[PDB]
Subunit: 325 residues, 4 copies
């Protein structure tokens, strides 16, 4: 008897179509039509599906994250064995980490997308979907954390980052490297991610309708973002993640303003515009409230800071979260 | 020997900390250029070495004024006989300073930026061998007309390609898209590639009579993007151009892009870049008509450099786009 | 409309197998080359296309015969007005063929090798896109005098730099030392570098009158190395040169190297390559007097090509070594 | 305070050369392990340090006897109260030694190999920070039961995954397939992963009574492969098993492969690996039935380690294959 797998659609290039077949950059397609490109998918599982959203992932929003988390918990309660989320590549890393911190089950939750529309020549979407379904039914897939499966690689939510903007091979874990690899429906695990997740993460969004407002600024030569920070704070921003230079260096023009705003209750997380590595926040700045995002990139750091702000307002406790999840 | 000028701007290669184990909580620009040089007597074999402190800052606090100062200083040095220049520089914004110099210096003579990931006081300090190698490169015969170069961790990277890609590791820089110009083995230089993007004498930007640059700032895009609030305030406070670190190949969340569209109609230039480390962005023909400019493969901070310089020549988005394709 | 010839050599791109999901157990070289073309209709829009099956084998079983023929057939074509050549090839030894042709083709006209990691019958087969991009490349006005190239997974790699660095992934090729020549997006060719190492017209190798090449074999170095016994046997059976894949930067275990030393004295040519994927090998001054030749950054199989061709002109280690510094 | 044994085997980390600039040509294995320890004082604050010199050699000359000696010494020290071990080792075959230990040490206590790419005496020598980090690691509470490790250049890599991927750079090691276990920041350890493949206690190999190991050699596949000759010679002179560095996903050119088939019928064990740095090998059912064994993702030299230990238990290809799927 087959595993019951549910596919939740959110949109994305994987379910898109463009008029040309050579053209990759950008209407919409039905998921039933996706499955007919990989019929044998129905051999791996008894497949049910629902539409959670239909967007370009670049347009992701909190509401979608909330629904997804609540939907997944509901289906797992009804004996769904695993979930595949068709998603766009642009913000897949963001959605992945969110669900990784909000879903209590040990059951497989896999995000999958494609770099080429369904009508392109050499479309990578069919194989990816196949592998994703093959991954969620595999017996070793429990307790791994939320995962991304693209281009035959299995990536952990906690580590996954988009590292090429155009190439079919678009994803990576710049600091952890892959959980494993897939060779024609055959799953091979290399690692277990140590960072605590799912049932072992203390975030409960079942009752929430919105999330604390967190936004993102950048740092550079002649930084003029001080202006942007004040304006964000005056418009309800509860938290700011800064993409610092090197290991979390924030240009003084901007840093003076953030210092002011710390004393007024803004939470400030220091992240980095650099793809690999960890940030360093001095003991001095930590005392002021600056929170280190460790190795978490700016958009992922935003995810954890938001969820942290549903529980506490104390920068010391928030820092504890960033050290653990 | 050939006449080589080493200019200090500060950085970690000149950084200090009382502990020998530590490499993370130091003060950048704590050491004079002329002290770093005595720590590596051998560089005096390679050339007639002279030096000068242009600044002693943490590169994260870089600013236009130093850039302008540095381009003028280098012009003057070359015009009075100096054969090549090494710049010691923090790593954080090194990629920015290099690309600016790549497009503003009118000589074929070698300009090399160098730095360290570890403070000069540290165990297995980074800086010494890096300075040695930088001097060896700038004295090499094949080093002319290469464009501005970053020489670090034995690798030779082009101004136009170089990006800091690790925040802690000694092997911290690469050319995500272009790939290294060359490699350095014990002072010996090997080139692999010619960079093809026009540079130096062939880049049309002149900063010699300028005391300021057009204001360009950077914004980011992500789920539930709120940068819209930010874009309007930057624009209201004199920001002339915005570089957006889009998701994917330069996608901008609808909340921010709507506002960008408003501000385009009011004279703001917008360059679309990417928060993604390698690859090019794509901008649709219709957004291009609106005035969105493709950063191509340049990242946000480097895209800002080119846009800034483009505003000293033109206001026409069409032509700014031609620059982004060429330089 | 350029006149472009596509030469079918075989490989996985012409691969077949019963299952659509399958990728490992296919039959490379089952599908005739003209079939593959009809499958990408947009191709005939880019050029006036012609084709011919030079061979339909597994690139695993590549040989000198095929290389000699292939280089002659291309010589012919470019003298009959053909503007560029695309070579569909298995992925396994594409890097060897590419480097050979790069040193043996006397034209400046584009020669692009292309292959696939998935058999033409698999879902999400990469072959058709790859074949499209290779035709786009060869037809491009800027593809002149670039060297022999490899066009696969949207990347454009030079023959002198290309190596397979993944055995299963469609992202299978890179240049661990030079880095990409350029990129392709949607038929559009973008060039980032020109490789400086001389090639084609400027390589002194002529194979037009050769029906065979000097015998050159490859050995590996490792802990408790037992290869000495292999070196002797090879030598006794006509081997004219041996390329060694040393550990690190060309270190050869004392057990093998001692044998290699006796053999040097009896006429054997020895080239020191490496088993490490990136970097350069370092041969000491005294090893080089013995006759050890450094491969520099060439990997073993690619180093084999240069040593082999080298032996059509000389047997002086001092001059082969110069060939390794230049090509 | 934990008791830590530092075992010296030589390597570049104990290398010496007259020049402070030069980084090639030195004599590896020149400095006593105690001198290297006394060079970094702070190490004494991390733990109660003892040291023994096991050998002082160039690691390209590693052999079975040193391996057996190491394995036994570690087992002994662990049973007599040592909390962790650090082995200073040459970088050339560090993969090999590391993986041997991974399969033969029946304890959960940390074992860490460390080395350097620059001789002790060179400027910006890496050795000292590497030795410090390695001690900090073996002392970390989280370091238990992680499998044998390589710590170098601030990275922590598992024996099962570690491979030397650059021949000259200080950043010389990675895990093409498994990635990194963690990172060190000034003796501050951060773990990211647990490797899943069985190691140490859960590995069934016992070399406690061995004075010798089964003879396993390595060959290479390439265009016009002539390795058949070397294979016959190796077999006849005593080789029990050969690993082949095949092209792409373990493809072996027909010339060598037909000879191996003949050798399979004579009791040769054949393991199929790849010259390709990342990815996993593919063997057909038909070939497996003849007795070809897939090395999976194990490179030639590390596959040799496992084939060799397997041969101490069984000569059954079916059984050896199960080992390659598990360890």
């Amino acid at each position: 008897a087959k595993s019951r797998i549910a596919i939740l659609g959110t949109g994305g290039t994987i379910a898109g179509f463009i008029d040309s077949t050579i053209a990759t950059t950008g209407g919409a397609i039905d998921i039933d039509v996706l499955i007919k490109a990989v019929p044998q998918i129905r051999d791996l599982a008894d497949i049910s599906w629902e539409q959670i959203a239909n967007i370009d992932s670049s347009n992701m929003c909190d509401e979608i994250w909330l629904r997804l988390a609540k939907k997944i918990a509901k289906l797992f309660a009804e004996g769904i064995d695993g979930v595949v989320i068709t998603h766009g590549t642009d913000t897949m890393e963001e959605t992945a980490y969110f669900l990784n911190l909000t879903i209590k089950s040990d059951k497989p939750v896999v995000l999958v997308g494609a770099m080429r529309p369904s009508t392109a020549i050499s479309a990578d979407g069919p194989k990816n979907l196949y592998n994703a379904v093959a991954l969620v039914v595999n017996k070793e897939a429990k307790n791994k954390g939320v995962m991304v499966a693209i281009n035959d690689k299995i990536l952990s939510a906690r580590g996954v980052v988009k590292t090429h903007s155009l190439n079919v091979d678009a994803f990576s874990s710049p600091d952890f490297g892959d959980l494993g690899y897939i060779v024609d429906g055959k799953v091979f695990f290399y690692n277990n991610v140590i960072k605590a997740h799912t049932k072992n993460a203390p975030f409960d969004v079942s009752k929430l309708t919105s999330l604390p407002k967190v936004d993102i600024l950048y740092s550079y030569s002649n930084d003029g973002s001080g202006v942007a920070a004040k304006a964000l704070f005056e418009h309800g921003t509860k938290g700011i993640v800064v993409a610092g230079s090197g290991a979390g260096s924030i240009h003084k023009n901007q840093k003076d303003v953030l210092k002011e705003l710390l004393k007024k209750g803004l939470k400030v997380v220091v992240s980095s515009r650099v793809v690999a590595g960890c940030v360093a926040v001095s003991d001095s700045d930590e005392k002021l409230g600056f929170i280190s995002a460790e190795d978490l990139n700016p958009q992922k750091a935003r995810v954890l800071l938001m969820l942290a702000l549903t529980k506490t307002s104390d920068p010391k406790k928030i820092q504890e979260y960033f050290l653990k999840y």
